[model samples]
Target: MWDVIVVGGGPSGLSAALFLARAGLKVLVLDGGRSKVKGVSRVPNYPGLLDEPSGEELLRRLEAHARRYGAEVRPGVVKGVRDMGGVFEVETEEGVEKAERLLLCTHKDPTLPSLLGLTRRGAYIDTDEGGRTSYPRVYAAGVARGKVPGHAIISAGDGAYVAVHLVSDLRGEPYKDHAL
Candidate 1:
């Protein structure tokens, strides 16, 4: 059982995994590898980037960072998620995985919200400012949370933000972002 089970291995999912793992949370990232970023050939407007980069390059770095922090990644397809007495039981290709918390970061897949038994505002799964869905313990980030669809970096930032907030909430503490 992981502290957090992150669905999707894209920028948002990986970014959240990295943050949570750094804070010593046991994180498992399940990604089927069909991220929108995979087809991005180049990124010219990325923050702190003086030169253009392929989207693949950016994702690679983010994934590596998360792994370095001890977040485990699994290439598995999530069929659906069930509420097993308030805990989340994710049905995947491999088997059912349980976690204390769940973060859905899959690329704009509208079917996912319905699978969670959550209502969607049009196409997007409705979420609060902290990425909290109708279900308190389950969060959504990146495009899955209805963020900017095509903006890769923005999605990544959103993921990081949600994870930090999650950590703070889980710890029952305030988060003060130290200047890096």
Candidate 2:
């Protein structure tokens, strides 16, 4: 079983996959290959690149790095998501993919986000803090669900932050409040 399946290839999505895969988990990154960053002319601020690279260059390298580390990369738009039995079913343009766990990185439209016409039938999942959705198998990050931002970078941290917390949760312990 795949340890984690990331649904999107943007910086935040890829970053989450990177961390999870680094943690010795099997992962897959399914991307539509289009995001707000693609329209930009330059990308010189992201860390670790030799120098300021073009937007395309940076995205290319990010995808390459994720795949080089054993993350499965695929191209397709997710249609809808649902839980069948104990496995999370990911519906895409091609078909449904099954995994033990799923991370939604796509910008799901609140008014219209069900992948397999689940919404049409009035069935859906609602998610909250620490990756708790109405259904336990599927977790999501990035912009708040039911609200998708036009620009994704704005929600990059949200995705990565949630991924870290989700990982901690999976390991059976929460990071202490550590408040002083």
Candidate 3:
């Protein structure tokens, strides 16, 4: 069983997967590879890239990093999500994926979240400050949460923050940042 299952394959989803996997969680990422970022000729805002690489290049790097840390990346669109007691069953076009926690990073698609009992308030998925949805084990990040949409950098940062919260919850301990 996976410790976490992330839906979507864009910056937010990949960022969360990279962090969670590095923290030793068994993470499964389902991405249909339809992110809007793929069509950009150039990403002008995101920092740290050598030459302001194309959107597709950025996405490729994110996916590579996530996989390097042990995330199982798959190509599929999630159709539905159901909570079975403590575990969640995510139904995808490929198959059903199970996980202790579900992170909805489906970008603009809220189908799975709606199926899992999340309602959108205005333009965003209803989530607490910590990214937890109405359902305890489900969380939202990046565009799905409707915060600072259209900014890849912001989305990635939000995803990392939410992932840390989920990690802390799963480990039954507070997570602290440290420098060596």
Candidate 4:
């Protein structure tokens, strides 16, 4: 069982895994690995990289970095998430993993009707700045959070923000930054 399992292997997903891995948590990344970067010609604004690395290359580097820092990476499709006994059961194509925590970053293709409960008063999981969700042990960032203009960096920031919030949840601490 993993201490935390992050779904979606996009920028946000890998960012979350990176932080948790560096934090010394037993993190697991279950991502299908498709993103909006599939159509980009070249990415030049990527931090300090002198070369324009392809989207696929960037993702591979992220995964490798996370694994290098000790986070486990698994390629799988998550059917859904449920709590079996006291553990969070992440339903996969093959089986379910009983994780202590889970972060659903894999935006449901059709959006499950059952997951509508993750809202207040049947409202909706409409995310605001910084990716704060109504549910505990769960967070959304980037396009999953909403219509953030600059996708990649904002998504990465969202992942970082949520991961820190998650750590705060585990440590019984308070989150300070709520800005985008």
Candidate 5:
């Protein structure tokens, strides 16, 4: 089983996958090809950008970065998710994939949250400050969480925040990533 399975390929999901993989966890990111970011013609506000890039181009770079860190990114339309005591079983069109933890970044599919028994608040899932959902080992970030606004930079930051928390939880202590 994988260490973590992220159910989205958007900015948030890809960011989380990148961090998780960098932390030495086996991470998988599944995309259904319905991210709202894909519809944007140009992303102008994101930091460190010399020129405005289309949303699709940004997503391409994000996916590549995550893969560089060893996260498996794939196309999969998830149908259901089950909390099997200690593990999560995610049912996709291809088959079932199991993971020790689950992260929901896609708000497009309401059935996924319901199947996983996650509490919903308005248009998003209800999560704690650290992105923990009602179900154990299940987390939500980005637009999946009601408190987060729908912005690429903000969503990516939320994903990174949750990833740090998750890494700390797995290591049984506080953790941070630094490079020189």
Candidate 6:
């Protein structure tokens, strides 16, 4: 069984997967193959990309970064998510995958939230400052949380924040990541 299953392949999801995998957790990212960022013609604001590459290129780099940390990224259309006590069963087009934790990073799709019976604020899922959803073991980040404007950098940061919280809770201690 995987430690965590992230739904979405956007900046937020990949960022979270990168951190979780770096912490030695088995992280799986199921992307439905439709990311809003793919439509962007150019990304000018993201730091370190002074050349202003296309959003698609940036996403490719993000996924590669996550993969480098041992996170598995797959293309799957998640149909539903079921909370089975301590484990979560994510039903995708391929099959059902089990994980100890679930993270929602997609903003356009409301299917999972409704299926999981999570409370929503406007068009997004309601979450605490740490990205904990109303449902236990189910967290949200990026535009899905609706805590901040939909920006690549902001979403990426939110993903890292939520991942830290998840790692801390799973390890039963406060977790900190400082790269030298």
Which one is best on lDDT?
6
| Candidate 6 global TM-score | 0.94
Q: Please give the distance, in angstroms, between residue 166's alpha carbon in candidate 4 and its true position after superposition.
A: 0.6
lDDT of 3 by residue, 72-179 (tens): 888887877777867988887667778999898877676776676687867778888879988888899998998754688888888888998999998889764455
Report the C-alpha lDDT of model 1 over 1-180, residue by residue, as the tens digit.
788999999989999999999989999999988988777788887788666678788888888999998999878878778778667898877688889899999867876777777667656778889888898788999888788645778888999999999899899996644668
| lDDT for each residue of candidate 5 in 1-180, tens digit (9 for 90 to 100) | 799999899989999999999999999999988888897899998898768799999999999999998999999887777767678888876678899888888854677887766788787888889998898788888888864558888888889899889888888898888996
Q: What CA RMSD would candidate 2 show?
A: 5.3
Cα-based RMSD of candidate 4: 4.3
| C-alpha TM-scores of all predictions | 0.91, 0.73, 0.93, 0.81, 0.94, 0.94
Instruction: List per-prediction Cα lDDT, in the order shown.
Output: 0.85, 0.63, 0.85, 0.69, 0.87, 0.90
Q: For model 5, which pairs clash? A: none
Q: Which segments of candidate 1 are over 4 A away from where they belong?
A: 176-180
> Where does model 2 exceed 4 Å of error?
47-50, 91-96, 111-129, 144-156, 174-180
Clashing pairs in 4: none
* Cα error, candidate 4, residue 120 (Å): 8.3
Superposition error at 178 for model 1 (Å):
3.3
For model 2, how does the per-residue alpha-carbon lDDT over 43-89 read when each residue is reduced to its tens digit?
65554544867777766776787777677777876656666778767
Residue 148 lDDT in model 3?
Answer: 58
CA RMSD of all predictions: 1.8, 5.3, 1.6, 4.3, 1.5, 1.3
Which candidate's TM-score is highest?
6
Candidate 3, residue 17: how far the Cα is off, in Å: 0.3
Q: After aligning candidate 1 to the native by TM-score, how far in Å is the CA of 82 from where it should be?
A: 1.9
